């Protein structure tokens, strides 16, 4: 929410995670072996509670879409990394010993357009491609409304250019794992403002139009 820090060098994180990444900066132990983390497989098998420290696999906390990364190529430091996602339905928390991560449930709504042919069963809140009217779809977005585009062929300059002068300002635009999420600014000066993008399904160009 009202924080700009996401690094974990008592790091406590309370933010709306939309495919946002957690940097667990931890030593190799070959230099200082006194330092340790109590959960070995942190961000994969992590305590659900704070006092009743019990190991639970990351599939059984309340995250919906996720991937956990351990990459050890850096000789100075090694990190265990997890991606969080907007699809979570509740405010879960977990503790790596202290690393307090809070995954706040997203208060506003979610709009998903799957122009790609795939079963993104995790978030079935949609328009599909059938709603596209003459191969153009016009999705209005309430304040803070989270729009997601599933099209793999996003080409370039998605949300960068807005037709008809003024461009619809987006606070954050995420392109993670071929998935394009639009965050509505939640405050707009004038309703008459447009943002655009391209997609290529069946070699036809399907384009989405977002307005307040």
């Amino acid at each position, epitope marked *: 929410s009202g924080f700009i820090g996401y690094k974990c060098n008592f790091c406590t994180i309370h933010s709306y995670f939309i495919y946002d990444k957690i940097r667990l900066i931890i030593p190799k132990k070959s230099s200082s072996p006194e330092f340790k983390i109590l959960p070995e497989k942190c961000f994969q098998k992590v305590y659900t509670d704070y006092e009743n420290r019990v190991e639970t696999d990351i599939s059984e906390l309340g995250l919906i879409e996720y991937e956990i990364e351990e990459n050890d190529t850096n000789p100075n430091y090694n990190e265990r990394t997890i991606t969080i996602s907007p699809f979570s339905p509740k405010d879960i928390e977990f503790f790596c010993f202290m690393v307090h991560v809070r995954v706040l449930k997203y208060p506003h709504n979610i709009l998903f357009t799957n122009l790609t042919n795939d079963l993104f069963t995790y978030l079935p809140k949609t328009y599909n491609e059938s709603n596209f009217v003459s191969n*153009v779809l*016009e999705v209005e977005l309430n304040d803070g409304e989270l729009f997601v585009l599933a099209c793999e062929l996003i080409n370039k300059k998605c949300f960068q*250019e807005g*037709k*008809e*002068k003024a461009l619809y300002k987006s606070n954050k635009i995420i392109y993670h794992k071929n998935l394009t999420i639009f965050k509505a600014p939640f405050y707009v000066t004038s309703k008459d403002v447009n943002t655009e993008c391209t997609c290529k399904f069946k*070699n*036809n*160009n399907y384009k989405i*139009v977002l307005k307040p």
Partner: antibody
Amino acid sequence: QVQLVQSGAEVRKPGASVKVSCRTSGYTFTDYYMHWVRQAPGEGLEWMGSINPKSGGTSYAERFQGRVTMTMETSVSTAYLDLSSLRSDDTAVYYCARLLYSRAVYYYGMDVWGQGTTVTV
Amino acid sequence: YELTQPPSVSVAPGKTARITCGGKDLGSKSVHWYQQKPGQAPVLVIYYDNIRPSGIPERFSGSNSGNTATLTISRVEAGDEADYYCQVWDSSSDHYVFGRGAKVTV
């Protein structure tokens, strides 16, 4: 099964009035914008004017503003172009075309065009 | 305003043809491309500057970038001998401005 049929070829003397009809058989009227485009012989196309389907539209080209009066009766679902004060620059082959009515108009194009009415002045 | 399409385009069979639709701030304004045969009605080939219609051969394509819009009709073959006009709806004047045209010859 779906097509746009216009009036037959007509010859009018200069200074007279010519009425061109565009009836929508396959497609229900007022769903799409109605546009009029004329092509002078051996010259590029020129869009005359557009009428909004939901409410009456006064959008006409500056060159054809004075002498073009486009009316929509919607009883027979036919588009009527009333043209008068013809001259050497007012003879062309006329084409009626439709684009989907939306709150913003820049998207969508003229997918279907009329048969074509030849007017000689 | 006015669209400064070239007066002509010269192309060979089995090649890419580029028709540039030139206009001031034409990236922010949609172009619609219409194929004009000598007697047949304008066949829409690109609308909203990159979309392919339901019924059309796949080779037709086009994009708009910056102040120029290019109709990339790749693999030019027989039957493409036509005039391609780009149409722009002018929002400020509320009147569509129609391109001068550019004949494509094989």
